[PDB]
Amino acid sequence: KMAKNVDKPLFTATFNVQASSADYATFIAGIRNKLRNPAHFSHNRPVLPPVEPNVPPSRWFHVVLKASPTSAGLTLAIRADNIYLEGFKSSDGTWWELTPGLIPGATYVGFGGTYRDLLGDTDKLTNVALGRQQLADAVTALHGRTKADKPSGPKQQQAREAVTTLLLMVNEATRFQTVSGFVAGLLHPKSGKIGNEMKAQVNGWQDLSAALLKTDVKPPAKFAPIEKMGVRTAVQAANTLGILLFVEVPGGLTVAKALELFHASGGK
Numbered sequence: 001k002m003a004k005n006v007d008k009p010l011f012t013a014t015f016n017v018q019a020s021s022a023d024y025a026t027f028i029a030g031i032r033n034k035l036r037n038p039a040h041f042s043h044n045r046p047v048l049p050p051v052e053p054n055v056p057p058s059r060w061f062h063v064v065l066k067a068s069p070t071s072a073g074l075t076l077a078i079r080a081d082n083i084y085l086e087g088f089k090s091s092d093g094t095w096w097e098l099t100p101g102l103i104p105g106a107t108y109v110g111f112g113g114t115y116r117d118l119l120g121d122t123d124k125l126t127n128v129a130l131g132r133q134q135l136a137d138a139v140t141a142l143h144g145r146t147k148a149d150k151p152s153g154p155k156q157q158q159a160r161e162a163v164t165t166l167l168l169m170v171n172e173a174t175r176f177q178t179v180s181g182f183v184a185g186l187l188h189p190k191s192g193k194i195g196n197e198m199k200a201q202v203n204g205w206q207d208l209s210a211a212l213l214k215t216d217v218k219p220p221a222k223f224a225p226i227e228k229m230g231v232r233t234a235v236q237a238a239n240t241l242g243i244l245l246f247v248e249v250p251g252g253l254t255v256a257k258a259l260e261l262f263h264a265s266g267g268k
């Protein structure tokens with residue numbers, strides 16, 4: 001059940017930590033546009049293709065974060081089907097994986113990519129500080145990771161804080177316009193923490209995605225509100241979502257069909 005093609009990304013997206021808000025916003029937009037199922041939209045927002053039924057994960061992209069203009073960057077291995085962070089490459093060339101035995105030749109980092117794993121309690125998410133400095137510190141801490149850092153309690157804690165930072169500023173920002181917008185603001189000519197609404201959105205990507213998709217089924221259908229996210233209408237949901245996870249909703253596309261539409265449309 002090992003992954004395939006981790007070393008053969010579908011695309012590579014690059015960001016310099018010192019760049020402007022504008023550069024960051026289009027970096028995020030670029031990732032969404034390249035991940036989209038060209039044939040499957042919902043309320044003008046892109047929707048991911050389904051996870052392929054019975055193969056191991058074979059669709060990956062890389063994000064490269066450079067702490068400096070010419071410096072080699074930190075490479076993130078992210079799944080193209082569900083935007084999971086599963087690996088990062090260090091300056092010594094070691095692949096660290098976040099799921100034991102998922103990436104050929106990798107070394108397990110010692111924890112996973114859920115906020116439960118990273119923070120102990122998911123409520124701690126609204127105390128994580130985001131900004132340009134945090135981004136630079138997170139990238140440097142993971143780029144400078146050595147194998148000996150794994151048996152160090154405090155090093156493991158710092159690595160978790162660094163991964164948590166990348167997850168919010170890269171993965172969740174891709175998923176959510178609220179998050180990407182929030183981060184772009186911190187990079188304008190610088191520290192912030194997300195509120196409880198963004199925390200609820202980030203913990204409910206599937207639910208919020210599935211709720212938009214339901215409104216698209218052809219009737220024989222209203223939007224179910226999600227109070228804790230602050231999202232009470234289809235339009236607020238469309239404005240909150242950057243890209244939807246594919247969810248098999250009753251009367252909408254099935255996994256099989258959406259996948260054939262993916263292939264027929266020039267998607268890989």
Ligand SMILES: Nc1ncnc2c1ncn2[C@@H]1O[C@H](COP(=O)(O)O)[C@@H](O)[C@H]1O
Binds near residue numbers: 098
């Ligand atoms: N490795 C990961 N990278 C990014 N997001 C993740 C990862 N693992 C879990 N998540 C997020 O957590 C949500 C729920 O995870 P789970 O409920 O444990 O299947 C997912 O839909 C993702 O938004």
